[model samples]
Target: MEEGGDFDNYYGADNQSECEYTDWKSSGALIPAIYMLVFLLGTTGNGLVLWTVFRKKGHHHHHH
Candidate 1:
């Protein structure tokens, strides 16, 4: 029987260097831009959503 045949090429650094979790060929400059946008918008959106549901909203709309 072939030993460790399923992972024969993956345990070495050569394979790690070739592995790509995501194809970013078209994301050259967009990666950083996307990161910035997500960070800014995510924080703001999540904050607003959480705030509306849990924070001070005396007369303001507070629905989940």
Candidate 2:
């Protein structure tokens, strides 16, 4: 009937095993490079869409 007393012991099981893959740190640079490139592409693409919409006076109908 001691809920608070066993809480620490119950959660302590999560830290029993340490991670084995420590070599994934090499891709840290590649991850950020891809992230920035994708971000840049998204920004420019959205800007182009906005520019087209405004140029057409808010008429965003797809002409196929």
Candidate 3:
């Protein structure tokens, strides 16, 4: 009891805690962020493949 008394009494017994992933806003932002990364990766991969294919010479030029 003393001067300060019990600190738990002031805080109550909920034992609640906050976390980043637990937040809806943060989770929502993460989904869109992941989607953007996938979208960018796919787009870049497709572009590079197209460029590589286009840059190749005709098979007729190959030596026997």
lDDT of each: 0.65, 0.66, 0.63
lDDT of 3 by residue, 1-64 (tens): 3456655644344335334437757678768887889889988898888766656633344331
Candidate 2 local lDDT, 1-64, one digit each (tens): 5466646655365455324224346656578798889988988888998888776865655642
Could you tell me how far off, in angstroms, the CA of residue 52 lies in candidate 1 after the best superposition? Answer: 7.1
For all predicted structures, in order, the TM-scores are 0.32, 0.33, 0.32
Model 2 residue pairs with clashes: none
Model 2, CA-based lDDT: 0.66
In candidate 2, what residue range of length 10 has the lowest lDDT sum?
Answer: 15-24
- Clash numbers, per candidate: 0, 0, 0
Residue 36 in model 1: lDDT: 84
Better of 2 and 3 by TM-score: 2
